[PDB]
Scaffold this motif. Sequence first.
Motif, PDB file in Angstrom:
ATOM      1  N   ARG A  78     -46.587  22.282  38.170  1.00  0.00           N
ATOM      2  CA  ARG A  78     -47.643  22.185  39.171  1.00  0.00           C
ATOM      3  C   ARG A  78     -47.921  23.481  39.926  1.00  0.00           C
ATOM      4  N   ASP A  79     -46.882  24.022  40.565  1.00  0.00           N
ATOM      5  CA  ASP A  79     -46.995  25.230  41.384  1.00  0.00           C
ATOM      6  C   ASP A  79     -47.398  26.507  40.654  1.00  0.00           C
ATOM      7  N   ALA A  80     -47.363  26.454  39.328  1.00  0.00           N
ATOM      8  CA  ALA A  80     -47.764  27.566  38.476  1.00  0.00           C
ATOM      9  C   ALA A  80     -48.162  26.923  37.165  1.00  0.00           C
ATOM     10  N   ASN A  81     -49.201  27.463  36.538  1.00  0.00           N
ATOM     11  CA  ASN A  81     -49.669  26.939  35.267  1.00  0.00           C
ATOM     12  C   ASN A  81     -48.757  27.450  34.150  1.00  0.00           C
ATOM     13  N   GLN A  82     -47.621  26.778  33.988  1.00  0.00           N
ATOM     14  CA  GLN A  82     -46.636  27.136  32.975  1.00  0.00           C
ATOM     15  C   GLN A  82     -46.062  25.853  32.385  1.00  0.00           C
ATOM     16  N   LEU A  83     -45.586  25.940  31.152  1.00  0.00           N
ATOM     17  CA  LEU A  83     -45.037  24.782  30.463  1.00  0.00           C
ATOM     18  C   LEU A  83     -43.517  24.754  30.404  1.00  0.00           C
ATOM     19  N   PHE A  84     -42.946  23.584  30.665  1.00  0.00           N
ATOM     20  CA  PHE A  84     -41.505  23.416  30.553  1.00  0.00           C
ATOM     21  C   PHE A  84     -41.345  22.751  29.196  1.00  0.00           C
ATOM     22  N   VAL A  85     -40.695  23.465  28.283  1.00  0.00           N
ATOM     23  CA  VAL A  85     -40.518  22.995  26.916  1.00  0.00           C
ATOM     24  C   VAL A  85     -39.077  22.694  26.518  1.00  0.00           C
ATOM     25  N   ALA A  86     -38.841  21.443  26.132  1.00  0.00           N
ATOM     26  CA  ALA A  86     -37.533  21.006  25.675  1.00  0.00           C
ATOM     27  C   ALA A  86     -37.383  21.562  24.256  1.00  0.00           C
ATOM     28  N   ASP A  87     -36.273  22.243  24.006  1.00  0.00           N
ATOM     29  CA  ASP A  87     -36.010  22.851  22.707  1.00  0.00           C
ATOM     30  C   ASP A  87     -34.686  22.323  22.157  1.00  0.00           C
ATOM     31  N   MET A  88     -34.719  21.826  20.927  1.00  0.00           N
ATOM     32  CA  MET A  88     -33.522  21.264  20.317  1.00  0.00           C
ATOM     33  C   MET A  88     -32.400  22.259  20.000  1.00  0.00           C
ATOM     34  N   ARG A  89     -32.724  23.549  19.989  1.00  0.00           N
ATOM     35  CA  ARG A  89     -31.740  24.602  19.719  1.00  0.00           C
ATOM     36  C   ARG A  89     -31.464  25.466  20.947  1.00  0.00           C
ATOM     37  N   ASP A  98     -49.549  33.177  28.175  1.00  0.00           N
ATOM     38  CA  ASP A  98     -49.654  34.401  27.374  1.00  0.00           C
ATOM     39  C   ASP A  98     -48.668  34.396  26.205  1.00  0.00           C
ATOM     40  N   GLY A  99     -47.842  33.354  26.143  1.00  0.00           N
ATOM     41  CA  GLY A  99     -46.879  33.221  25.066  1.00  0.00           C
ATOM     42  C   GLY A  99     -45.459  33.667  25.348  1.00  0.00           C
ATOM     43  N   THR A 100     -45.230  34.335  26.480  1.00  0.00           N
ATOM     44  CA  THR A 100     -43.884  34.781  26.830  1.00  0.00           C
ATOM     45  C   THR A 100     -43.085  33.577  27.323  1.00  0.00           C
ATOM     46  N   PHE A 101     -41.766  33.648  27.209  1.00  0.00           N
ATOM     47  CA  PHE A 101     -40.931  32.541  27.642  1.00  0.00           C
ATOM     48  C   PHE A 101     -39.598  33.021  28.194  1.00  0.00           C
ATOM     49  N   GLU A 102     -38.913  32.113  28.879  1.00  0.00           N
ATOM     50  CA  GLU A 102     -37.607  32.379  29.444  1.00  0.00           C
ATOM     51  C   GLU A 102     -36.756  31.150  29.179  1.00  0.00           C
ATOM     52  N   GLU A 103     -35.480  31.388  28.919  1.00  0.00           N
ATOM     53  CA  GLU A 103     -34.511  30.333  28.676  1.00  0.00           C
ATOM     54  C   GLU A 103     -34.046  29.912  30.075  1.00  0.00           C
ATOM     55  N   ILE A 104     -34.037  28.612  30.354  1.00  0.00           N
ATOM     56  CA  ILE A 104     -33.636  28.138  31.680  1.00  0.00           C
ATOM     57  C   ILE A 104     -32.130  28.084  31.936  1.00  0.00           C
ATOM     58  N   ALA A 105     -31.354  27.590  30.975  1.00  0.00           N
ATOM     59  CA  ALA A 105     -29.910  27.487  31.181  1.00  0.00           C
ATOM     60  C   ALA A 105     -29.057  27.375  29.925  1.00  0.00           C
ATOM     61  N   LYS A 106     -28.004  28.183  29.865  1.00  0.00           N
ATOM     62  CA  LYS A 106     -27.083  28.139  28.736  1.00  0.00           C
ATOM     63  C   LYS A 106     -25.922  27.198  29.077  1.00  0.00           C
ATOM     64  N   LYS A 107     -25.804  26.861  30.365  1.00  0.00           N
ATOM     65  CA  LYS A 107     -24.772  25.959  30.888  1.00  0.00           C
ATOM     66  C   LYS A 107     -25.329  25.099  32.029  1.00  0.00           C
ATOM     67  N   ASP A 108     -24.811  23.883  32.185  1.00  0.00           N
ATOM     68  CA  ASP A 108     -25.267  23.005  33.264  1.00  0.00           C
ATOM     69  C   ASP A 108     -24.571  23.314  34.606  1.00  0.00           C
ATOM     70  N   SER A 109     -24.815  22.487  35.618  1.00  0.00           N
ATOM     71  CA  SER A 109     -24.230  22.685  36.944  1.00  0.00           C
ATOM     72  C   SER A 109     -22.703  22.593  36.984  1.00  0.00           C
ATOM     73  N   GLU A 110     -22.109  22.052  35.926  1.00  0.00           N
ATOM     74  CA  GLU A 110     -20.662  21.912  35.843  1.00  0.00           C
ATOM     75  C   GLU A 110     -20.034  22.965  34.932  1.00  0.00           C
ATOM     76  N   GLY A 111     -20.840  23.923  34.484  1.00  0.00           N
ATOM     77  CA  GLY A 111     -20.345  24.968  33.606  1.00  0.00           C
ATOM     78  C   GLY A 111     -20.165  24.545  32.156  1.00  0.00           C
ATOM     79  N   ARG A 112     -20.616  23.337  31.833  1.00  0.00           N
ATOM     80  CA  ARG A 112     -20.528  22.786  30.484  1.00  0.00           C
ATOM     81  C   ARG A 112     -21.700  23.360  29.680  1.00  0.00           C
ATOM     82  N   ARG A 113     -21.460  23.698  28.415  1.00  0.00           N
ATOM     83  CA  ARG A 113     -22.520  24.244  27.564  1.00  0.00           C
ATOM     84  C   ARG A 113     -23.717  23.300  27.521  1.00  0.00           C
TER      85      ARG A 113
END
Length: 312
Positions: A78-89, A98-113
């Motif tokens: 909402r606050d920015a015209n960007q897509l949150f995309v669930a990725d199986m890998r 514009d096609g650029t992306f960022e990875e949100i998290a390699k680990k959760d809040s508990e440090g689990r992969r």
Amino acid sequence: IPVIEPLFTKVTEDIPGAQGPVFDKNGDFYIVAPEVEVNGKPAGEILRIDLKTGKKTVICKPEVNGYGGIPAGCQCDRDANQLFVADMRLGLLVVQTDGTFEEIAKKDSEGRRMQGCNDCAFDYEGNLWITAPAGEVAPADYTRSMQEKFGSIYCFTTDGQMIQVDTAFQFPNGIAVRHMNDGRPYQLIVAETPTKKLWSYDIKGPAKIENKKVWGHIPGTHEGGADGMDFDEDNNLLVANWGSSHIEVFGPDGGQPKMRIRCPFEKPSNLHFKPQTKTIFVTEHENNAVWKFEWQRNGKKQYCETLKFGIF
Ligand SMILES: [Ca+2]
């Protein structure tokens, strides 16, 4: 159970494993092609579809450290015209127009992969509920919970926390948030594909769900079951029943479907409403295509359509 057969109009074709249909804040349409591969290795894509011509444009082909993604589901912010995309890998990604992306998290809040995700759903508070039917994200060997119960559920909060809210699902897939008439999020619905079940939880707050319950039952004994889903303006839940040639329509109280929608294909994967219309765009795996049909009413207002700085 009464069945309707609306006219499905072809939108676009040749999209390997077509799914994750979504509209952004400008009304532009996007879909994901999770099964596009390069030499047998994952090379999934996120595409923009020109609704006037049906022409496709690959805007993002996500890769992290040489590991190609398997983009599977989308929600527009909402606050920015960007897509949150669930990725199986790759887990959860944030993709710009514009096609650029960022990875949100390699680990959760508990440090689990982190686990590979398939679909997500924003509640009106801005919290993102996510399904993770895959095992650990790349570089870990690709695995999926189709036979064993290792699929999880997450909630990516407004304060940036990736919180695992439940586990032990046999391929958690479609996901949707039910809100009260006043906009308060109060129920989370999760599809568990092979078991032919729709599960529900009471949302008590951000990343807080209680009372897991078998909310709905998906028809058929075919291989498959509930895939993607979405609510209409009257809170009826439309669910893609992969392998049944139907989209099931559940009433606000769940249980058995109160209506079915016959598709001119066997494998509907996901569905999404065009803002301010009765038009539902349906992605499917039989022909790897996208179609559209008219529902009985408009779709539920998406989080991206709401106003942060409004009066009402
Ligand atoms: Ca959708």
